[PDB]
Amino acid sequence: LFQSDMTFKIFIDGEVNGQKFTIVADGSSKFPHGDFNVHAVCETGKLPMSWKPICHLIEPFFARYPDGISHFAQECFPEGLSIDRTVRFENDGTMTSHHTYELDDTCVVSRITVNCDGFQPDGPIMRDQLVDILPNETHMFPHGPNAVRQLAFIGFTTADGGLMMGHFDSKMTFNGSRAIEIPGPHFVTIITKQMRDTSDKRDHVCQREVAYAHSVPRIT
Amino acid sequence: ALFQSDMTFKIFIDGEVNGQKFTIVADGSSKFPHGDFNVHAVCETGKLPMSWKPICHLIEPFFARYPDGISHFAQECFPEGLSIDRTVRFENDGTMTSHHTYELDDTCVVSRITVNCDGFQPDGPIMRDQLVDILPNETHMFPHGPNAVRQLAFIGFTTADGGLMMGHFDSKMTFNGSRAIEIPGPHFVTIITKQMRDTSDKRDHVCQREVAYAHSVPRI
């Protein structure tokens, strides 16, 4: 069902410290997956915050799993799946988001509402002072009969060669009402990287991401 | 990195849980090249007044197997040694704050720990000792200034009834020397652990072994 090149559209309806902003983005994922790109544009004009922190908002299902481990994100289709995420930033604001993933034959469509409250006007976030997104080892845990929980440490290198840590916490619920196999505790490596377009007179950002799952056996 | 030979270690934990004191002394040895070793700990004050699981991280960053390429801060810290400041917040349960001190005595490293365990839930799986497994995880290492490393991890505990208790691990490793040490870039250290009661022993004596090895992930 994900055995072929695919496409996706992201519609993000968000707000930051009361100020609204919206973003549309889309991209493709060659097969196999776990290495794809996205092109997102802030339709409200210049994004009112560093793009960095939104990297995780603009495709679990496009991460290449090995055989042993089950790809919950994909199994969820066609009935799609929901996502309740949270990311608390150390000494700055936090961003709650709700995700909606609808499949469209070859194109998967997600709708997202994201709140970004309590952000520091002088923090490296509001001041666009984040330069890097540190690669990290995501933590995947079973969660009820139908869910899967994803905990992560997203770090962004600041301008002073400092480090901004985000505490990532995301619940992925399968929409269907049918028996789906939940997988055992594992991890998913996420290496991302975004980039200025320079073509559009508009705030348009390109972000690549490579993601692949893996296990580590218990002591027998 | 004069950890070329084998080592031994003595741990003296001076702790307390929701106001009730308790003390632990442990010792063990690490065969070269380390990253697979055992500790044997016993609760001198008698029966540990809480699950042993949560105190698995108390009973050695330096006995982890690092590959060539990543600086081994923990070992670099010697012979003068290092101290650790750490917090582990447990979901729906209490949190434990500990201060660590490490020094190398010949070929045997000794450490003393103080640890407050507060707000722990009497009816929880920690106080009612219902934790079963220690989920293997990928702890996150970060550079933290000129003479310290930061460690972040998700420590998950299986509950008897197939549930999950999550611990939010946050550890700072400060170098005590008055030299200039080499701080490593963001990397990871895999940590599998297993506990086992030494029944032959009449005291509250639990044995623990863990294998810990580091690695990194290239950027794009």
UniProtKB/TrEMBL annotation, chain B:
Top-rank lineage group of the source organism: Eukaryota
Gene Ontology terms: biological process: bioluminescence; generation of precursor metabolites and energy
Chain positions with Cysteine sulfenic acid (-SOH) modification: 108, 207
Keywords assigned by UniProt, alphabetized: Chromophore, Luminescence, Photoprotein
Pfam families: GFP
Family designation: Belongs to the GFP family.
Protein name per Swiss-Prot or TrEMBL: KillerRed
Taxonomic placement: Eukaryota, Metazoa, Cnidaria, Hydrozoa, Hydroidolina
